[PDB]
Structure prediction request, 119 residues.
Amino acid sequence: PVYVDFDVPADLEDDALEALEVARDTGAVKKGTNETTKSIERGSAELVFVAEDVQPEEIVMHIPELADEKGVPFIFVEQQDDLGHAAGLEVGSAAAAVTDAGEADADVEDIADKVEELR
RNA sequence: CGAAGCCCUCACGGGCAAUGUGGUGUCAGGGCUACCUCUCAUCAGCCGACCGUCUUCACGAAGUCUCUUGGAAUAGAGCGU
Ligand SMILES: [Mg+2]
Ligand SMILES: [Sr+2]
Prediction:
């Protein structure tokens, strides 16, 4: 909520999580806020995901400002458990990162372009 | 590094854990990269006392002889261990 500056539509979120499911079975993904943060700093992150139901908000707070100065695109997911299942975990995830997509590079590029049109 | 982990249960199965279980590491700084050599340090775990001290216990030598006094010798004198 405090780190959220734009609302992402349910349709765009469906596209995003589907692209993440095929990113783990082909390319490579980073699961968890610590690994997502290191990906943005190292530059290896292509697209970063962030949950909106994170309590406390401090865990994720830095991602929207850190990604802006590193050129890495970010998208908001409504639920924590949906992002965790999409990353391939039994538990939830506050943040996920796509470190070089696989056979979804065209979809990821479009998601990154649809988010910029939504500010 | 990133699920490689932990708890419950005979098992099955369940719970925990990416908001990080677990590995690494902790100022002789450490990590990472490139190498030299090596370990007996440390940490985890198995085994597991001696001696001493405190207390309790077993065993454990040699007269119940003479006389006098006395209610009674454990006294005096004498002999003996
Ligand atoms: Mg350790
Ligand atoms: Sr959770």
About this structure: Residues 30-36, 54-56, 58-60, 80, 84, 87, 89-96 of chain A lie near RNA strand B (CB under 10 Å from a C1').
